Every structure is written in C-alpha cells, then in structure tokens.
Amino acid sequence: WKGIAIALLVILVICSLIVTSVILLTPAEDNSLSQKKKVTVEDLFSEDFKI
Amino acid sequence: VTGFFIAVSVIANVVETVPCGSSPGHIKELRYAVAFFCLDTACVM
C-alpha cells in the first residue's frame, strides 16, 4: 500500500496549513499596553515636579 | 482523515481547560489562545 498513507499525510499537511493560517489571521491579540510606570528618584529632580 | 480529525477534536476538548491553555497561569500580565474555538468550528463543519 503506502499510497493511501502518503495521500493522507499530504491532505493532513494541507489542512494543518489552512487551520494554522486561520489561527494566525483570525484573532486580535492587540491589548496595546496598560499600567503606569512607578516613581523613581530621577523623577523627583526633573523639571516636571518643580512648583 | 475523519478518524484523525475526531481525535484532534476530542483532544482539543480535553485541553480546553488545561491551566496553561485556560484562564489561570497568567493574571499578572495577561497564552489563553481562543483559537481553540476555530478548531472546533472546522471539525464540526
């Protein structure tokens, strides 16, 4: 046999490529960025905090 | 091919709540790939 096996694995490769392309293209995953940076000593002596 | 895709569908359903692939494991920063859904859809059709 083994012709059945090679045809099968070819079809599996094609279907896997299709499904992984869908997996790559479909979702967003773009949460951008959140949270604000904490306070460090360099911030104190910057011109930003001058009263 | 039908047997193989039934196997992947059932294994995906099993994995659906694996902590690495589910809500836990990432709370400090956020992976929880929802693409599982798509796989289900494909198998179903």
From Swiss-Prot, chain A:
Signal peptide: none annotated. It comes from the Eukaryota. The chain crosses the membrane at residues 4-24. N-glycosylated. Expressed predominantly in brain. It is found in: Cell membrane. Promotes cell surface expression of the potassium channel KCND2. Modulates the activity and gating characteristics of the potassium channel KCND2. Has no dipeptidyl aminopeptidase activity. Belongs to the peptidase S9B family. Homodimer (in vitro). Interacts with KCND2. Identified in a complex with KCND2 and KCNIP2. Forms an octameric complex composed of four DPP6 subunits bound to the KCND2 tetramer. Interacts with KCND3; this interaction modulates the channel gating kinetics namely channel activation and inactivation kinetics and rate of recovery from inactivation. It is linked to Familial paroxysmal ventricular fibrillation 2: A cardiac arrhythmia marked by fibrillary contractions of the ventricular muscle due to rapid repetitive excitation of myocardial fibers without coordinated contraction of the ventricle and by absence of atrial activity. Genetic variation in DPP6 may influence susceptibility to amyotrophic lateral sclerosis (ALS). ALS is a severely disabling and lethal disorder caused by progressive degeneration of motor neurons in the brain, spinal cord and brainstem. This is A-type potassium channel modulatory protein DPP6. It comes from Homo sapiens. The gene is DPP6. The chain holds residues 93 to 143 of 865 of the full protein.
Curated annotation (Swiss-Prot), chain B:
Residues 18-33 are extracellular. Coiled coil: none annotated. It is found in: Cell membrane; Cell projection, Dendrite; Synapse; Perikaryon. Detected in ovary, in corpus luteum and in granulosa and theca cells in the follicle (at protein level). Highly expressed throughout the brain. Detected in amygdala, caudate nucleus, cerebellum, hippocampus, substantia nigra and thalamus. Expression is not detectable or very low in heart, kidney, liver, lung, pancreas and skeletal muscle. Not detectable in human heart atrium. The chain crosses the membrane at residues 1-17. Phosphorylated by MAPK in response to signaling via the metabotropic glutamate receptor GRM5. Homotetramer or heterotetramer with KCND1 or KCND3. Associates with the regulatory subunits KCNIP2, KCNIP3 and KCNIP4. Interacts with the regulatory subunit KCNIP1; this interaction mediates the capture of both the N- and C-terminus of KCND2, preventing N-type inactivation and stabilizing the S6 conformation, thereby accelerating closed state inactivation and recovery. In vivo, probably exists as heteromeric complex containing variable proportions of KCND1, KCND2, KCND3, KCNIP1, KCNIP2, KCNIP3, KCNIP4, DPP6 and DPP10. Belongs to the potassium channel family. D (Shal) (TC 1.A.1.2) subfamily. Kv4.2/KCND2 sub-subfamily. It is linked to KNCD2 mutations have been found in a family with autism and epilepsy and may play a role in disease pathogenesis. Autism is a complex multifactorial, pervasive developmental disorder characterized by impairments in reciprocal social interaction and communication, restricted and stereotyped patterns of interests and activities, and the presence of developmental abnormalities by 3 years of age. A KCND2 mutation leading to the production of a C-terminally truncated protein has been identified in a patient with epilepsy. Epilepsy is characterized by paroxysmal transient disturbances of the electrical activity of the brain that may be manifested as episodic impairment or loss of consciousness, abnormal motor phenomena, psychic or sensory disturbances, or perturbation of the autonomic nervous system. Voltage-gated potassium channel that mediates transmembrane potassium transport in excitable membranes, primarily in the brain. Mediates the major part of the dendritic A-type current I(SA) in brain neurons. This current is activated at membrane potentials that are below the threshold for action potentials. This is A-type voltage-gated potassium channel KCND2. The chain holds residues 190 to 238 of 630 of the full protein.
